[PDB]
């Protein structure tokens, strides 16, 4: 007598939103926004360097905590909150730019500057940099007058980058905790440090004075840097207060740098990282961390956006 067409339905549908309507129930749906974080840095298959107590910029100068990171090689570089770039207190000018350079560097290779010295002391040390006794930045030399209060001779040192890639060059200006202390180390007078390449020019006059004690020291070191292009020459003309580079740094290739508070895990793979871990997902959006880096789902404000994968649910 008759035949009837129809469609399936279920008891428990899933709500989704449409152009015309909020909360329409459909037979099935699936999430588009990722909310599940893995609380580890998922580093399977990647050359990983976890800097721990070594600060990224310290890999260039070499305080004792960075002794094992002077020539590292990496796909993934992890910075930690406890990392410190210094032993003897100080900081870098254009510091964040340099961190960004080092984070994508692939790591660093070191080579001697070829600097030799006469007429001065070369082995300044301090209790702030401990290596079974007082020491100093591994990659630098604290240049001093031969004896207390002696005049530091006007000096010139030059280095030519004979390599195919640009050279990262670093130096330091030492600000003693007092004028008397400056004269004792480098002789009296207002010292001058000049630095120039073919695309860079700048000068520095120190400034002794009492700072609050950090790592037991009231002095500071200003660290400065520049990229020296292939075949370019850098010249250092200085009269004291100068922390000389012992070695130049070269970038190895490509890497990605992250900041995190969680442990490395070689049992999971992922390419989207943030401080709380790894977002592993094929979904196009995520609501976990707007500062996630790598190859990530897009950050959105919504916790959930359900995509219908079935018809409208019409139960009896």
């Amino acid at each position: 007598d008759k035949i009837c067409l129809g469609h399936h339905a279920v008891s428990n549908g899933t709500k989704v939103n449409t152009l015309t309507e909020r909360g329409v129930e459909v037979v099935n749906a699936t999430e588009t926004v990722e909310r599940t974080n893995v609380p580890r840095i998922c580093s399977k298959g990647k050359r990983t360097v976890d800097l721990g107590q070594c600060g990224l910029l310290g890999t260039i100068t070499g305080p004792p905590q960075c002794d094992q990171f002077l020539e590292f090689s990496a796909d993934l570089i992890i910075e930690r909150r406890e990392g410190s770039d210094v032993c003897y207190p100080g900081k870098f000018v254009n510091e964040e730019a340099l961190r960004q350079i080092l984070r994508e560097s692939g790591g660093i290779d070191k080579e001697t500057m070829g600097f030799t010295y006469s007429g001065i002391r070369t082995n300044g040390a301090t209790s702030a940099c401990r290596r079974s006794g007082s020491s100093f930045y591994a990659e630098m030399k604290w240049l001093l007058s031969n004896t207390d209060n002696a005049a530091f001779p006007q000096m010139t040192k030059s280095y030519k980058n004979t390599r195919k890639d640009p050279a990262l060059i670093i130096w330091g200006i030492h600000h003693s905790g007092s004028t008397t202390e400056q004269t004792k180390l480098y002789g009296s007078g207002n010292k001058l440090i000049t630095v120039g390449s073919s695309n860079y020019q700048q000068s520095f006059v120190p400034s002794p004075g009492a700072r609050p004690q950090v790592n037991g020291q009231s002095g500071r070191i200003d660290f400065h840097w520049l990229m020296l292009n292939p075949n370019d020459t850098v010249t250092f003309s200085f009269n004291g207060a100068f922390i000389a580079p012992d070695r130049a740094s070269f970038l190895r290739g490509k890497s990605m740098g992250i900041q995190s508070s969680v442990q490395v895990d070689a049992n999971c793979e992922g390419d989207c990282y943030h401080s709380g871990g790894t977002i592993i997902s094929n979904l196009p959006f995520q609501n976990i961390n707007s500062r996630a880096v790598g190859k990530c789902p897009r950050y959105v404000k919504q916790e959930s956006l359900m995509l219908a994968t079935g018809m409208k649910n019409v139960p009896e």
Binding site: D1, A9, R298, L307
Partner: protein, 170 residues
Amino acid sequence: GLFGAIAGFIENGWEGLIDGWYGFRHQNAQGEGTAADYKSTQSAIDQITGKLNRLIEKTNQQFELIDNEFTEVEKQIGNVINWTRDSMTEVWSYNAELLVAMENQHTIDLADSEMNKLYERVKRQLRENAEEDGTGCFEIFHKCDDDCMASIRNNTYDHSRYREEAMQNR
């Protein structure tokens, strides 16, 4: 929906239909029976599947850190960065909401369309041998047994065979 079948002239769906998305339920001297339509079900499933293949991925586009959570970047550059990121968050949250709402409208209409099409295919098969009920049902005038029903489902039904009877039985 736009085609007025699902949640339309068909009053409700069948929970018992566990074999497919669209189906047939008949009534003859032999009793009542139900069966899923493969082609309609498959066409809807393949189209939904295609949407997921497009949507469920993220880019091979790498982004790096431009600020710092341990030692803060300079305030002016930091505020520019935050303003830019917040603007991007606003663009993407809008895109995602709109994408999903639009896909869902289309997905719902797509299923409604596939139902309507099946309905119309059967109607055209039956010619003058049946009449529309209005509730998604075709009243057949001649006697139609389980072969006759199976022929309707398999699209092997010959209207001319039973034409004389149903034409008279009008």
